[PDB]
């Protein structure tokens, strides 16, 4: 890897600089290099890893949706040749490559070394997320297997989070939020999505009284996203 010669601490320092500069492709390459040093990641470092790749894949997802929309209109009317499909495929392939890279880092060897609930749930949620992003563009004979891989990762993360974390924990909340999005947008299960969002919100509400002002702010921020989705979905 091109980052093999750089110190771990320097990679982390430069990841933070790249974030400030909104250079998320650089940020992701720096954090990939940091992961490949082989040491476990701290809470802050896990968040840097997620911020970097979420922004990279976020740009690819937005582009893919634009191109896919154009492609579907073309098939309603004038023929224009293969270019729209070709370029949609180009972006799609790049997106799939980023997802495969993240999933590879989780499998080699972030997840197997993660023993604390906060790290293990964070990484398993990430695994579900990037299989979900793959599912968003999947159309062939492995769409079903991609969907079940996302579901399986989310479910393992959910089981741990319910046993080991309070209902207001932001990682637990963000996991439940994203699993509910998986149900609604990927798995054709809107009722499951709604039920999960409502129970997650209500169980967090009842635990807010235990929190400091700062933790209350962290938790209510994610709870509002659950509420926004319920308003969209009902």
């Amino acid at each position: 890897g091109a980052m093999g010669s750089m110190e771990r601490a320097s990679l982390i320092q430069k990841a933070k600089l790249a974030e400030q500069a909104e250079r998320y492709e650089d940020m992701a390459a720096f954090m990939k290099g940091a992961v490949e040093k082989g040491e476990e990641l701290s809470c802050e470092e896990r968040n840097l890893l997620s911020v970097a790749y979420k922004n990279v894949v976020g740009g690819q997802r937005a582009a893919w949706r634009v191109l896919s929309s154009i492609e579907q209109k073309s098939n309603e009317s004038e023929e224009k040749g293969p270019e729209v499909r070709e370029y949609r495929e180009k972006v799609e392939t790049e997106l799939q490559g980023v997802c495969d890279t993240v999933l590879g880092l989780l499998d080699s060897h972030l997840i197997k070394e993660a023993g604390d609930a906060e790290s293990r749930v964070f990484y398993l949620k990430m695994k579900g997320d990037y299989y979900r992003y793959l599912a968003e563009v999947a159309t062939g004979d492995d769409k079903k297997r991609i969907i079940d891989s996302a579901r399986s990762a989310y479910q393992e993360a959910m089981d741990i989070s319910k046993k080991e974390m309070p209902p207001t924990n932001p990682i637990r909340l963000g996991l439940a939020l994203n699993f509910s999005v998986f149900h609604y947008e990927i798995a054709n299960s809107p009722e499951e999505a709604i039920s999960l969002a409502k129970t997650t919100f209500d169980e967090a509400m009842a635990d807010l009284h235990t929190l400091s002002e700062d933790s209350y702010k962290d938790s209510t921020l994610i709870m509002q996203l659950l509420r926004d989705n319920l308003t969209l979905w009902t």
């Binding site: 997320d129 990682i171 909340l173 509910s180 989705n229």
Partner: peptide, 10 residues
């Protein structure tokens, strides 16, 4: 589309 989680979680 639905809202998903921010990347950074405490």
């Amino acid at each position: 589309r639905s809202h998903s989680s921010p990347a950074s979680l405490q």
